[PDB]
């Protein structure tokens, strides 16, 4: 009841579009990104969300659990920057994540800890993309040989209340690749 949390078994990943005439309200050079979610899990390695085109050349922004901690990572064109949390995420207790990027600056907050901040190397400031978004793992994998196994590892656990750039994401209804729906708990 209430918050409709969906679960992720390790072979489940949803593709969302975000940003294109669809009802209410070419390339894209985002100056920002803002992501909000709540996750419950026992996993110590897994990929949560990933916004990019999924091509080797493409810039990206993603969130993954790496060796027990949630870490934001993105490359805009001048190499990556990693923002890692001090809050052990694997307690199988719903936990909040709040992350954003303003040009080159980004922050990360898991729980109530102090937000982790940083900024990619001087150079690019905009994230080139077609609006592809992904949840729980991702299709185009090749572009995962350069990252830790974690981004290769699908996510096992649940997720709910995903907010991407002031719009709320309806996991089921917005999913574009018709995946197997398994509620949570």
- The reply to whether 128 sits in an annotated binding site is yes
Residue with tokens 């072979």: 11
Extract the tokens encoding 183: 């509620």
- The reply to whether 165 sits in an annotated binding site is no
- The reply to whether 76 sits in an annotated binding site is yes
Q: In 19-168, which ranges are E strands?
A: 29-30, 32-40, 45-52, 60-66, 69-75, 81-84, 95-102, 105-110, 116-119, 127-128, 133-135, 156-164, 167-168
Helix then strand then coil, in percent of the chain rounded to 5, is 5, 45, 55
- The reply to whether 126 sits in an annotated binding site is yes
Annotated binding site: 59, 76, 126, 128
Annotated binding site for Ca(2+): 59, 76, 126, 128
């Amino acid at each position: 009841g209430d918050a409709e949390a969906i679960a992720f078994d390790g072979r489940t990943y949803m593709e969302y579009h975000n940003a294109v005439t669809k009802s209410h309200l070419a390339e894209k050079a985002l100056q920002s990104n803002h992501f909000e979610l709540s996750i419950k899990t026992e996993a110590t390695q897994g990929l949560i969300l990933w916004s990019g085109k999924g091509l080797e050349r493409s810039d990206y922004i993603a969130l993954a659990i790496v060796d027990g901690f949630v870490q934001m990572m993105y490359d805009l064109g001048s190499k990556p920057v990693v923002l890692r949390s001090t809050v052990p995420i694997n307690t199988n207790h719903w936990t909040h994540i709040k992350a954003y990027r303003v040009q080159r600056e980004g922050s990360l907050q898991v729980g109530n800890e102090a937000p982790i901040t940083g900024s990619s190397p001087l150079g690019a400031t905009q994230l080139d993309t077609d609006g592809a978004l992904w949840l729980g793992g991702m299709e185009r994998l090749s572009v995962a040989h350069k990252l830790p196994k974690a981004y290769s590892t699908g996510f096992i656990g649940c997720i709910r209340d995903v907010i991407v750039d002031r719009q709320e994401l309806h996991l089921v209804e917005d999913a574009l690749n018709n995946p197997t729906i398994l509620h949570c708990s």
